[PDB]
């Protein structure tokens, strides 16, 4: 862990991966989820690449990550898009994908503790 997905995979491969999976899963968003840059407080996910139903909201996705990580009540986090962009949690991921998707076709998200930002 701790190598960005973008450094582990060529641009050509990432584009193709997104194109191929979207053919088979047209109602799914391809999402890369990684620990915030310089993040030490939260634990790592087993897997980085997710296929998320596009009708789902950002808030539902947060609940899913809380479950993957098996977090305690006291560990809180925000799900930021790209490097550090905050997005309303009430937003459908289909909406976020349309606006924030990367050039390779992946949506990049990072999770970071809320306390890092003064919460």
């Amino acid at each position: 862990s701790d190598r960005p997905f973008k450094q582990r995979r060529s641009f050509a491969d990432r584009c193709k991966e997104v194109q191929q999976i979207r053919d088979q899963h047209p109602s799914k968003i391809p999402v890369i989820i990684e620990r915030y840059k310089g993040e030490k407080q939260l634990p790592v996910l087993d897997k980085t690449k997710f296929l998320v139903p596009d009708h789902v909201n950002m808030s539902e996705l947060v609940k899913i990550i809380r479950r993957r990580l098996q977090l305690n009540p006291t560990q809180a986090f925000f799900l930021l898009v790209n490097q550090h962009s905050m997005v309303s949690v009430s937003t459908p991921i289909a909406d976020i994908y349309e606006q924030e998707k990367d050039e390779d076709g992946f949506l990049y998200m990072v999770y970071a503790s809320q306390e890092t930002f003064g919460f």
Binding site: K28, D46, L51, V56, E60, L61, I64
Partner: peptide
């Protein structure tokens, strides 16, 4: 190593309650 996608299932989604 991220070879395969982690697919969020509908079943996993119906496990997410709301107050």
């Amino acid at each position: 190593d991220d070879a395969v996608f982690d697919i969020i299932t509908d079943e996993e989604l119906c496990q997410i309650q709301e107050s």
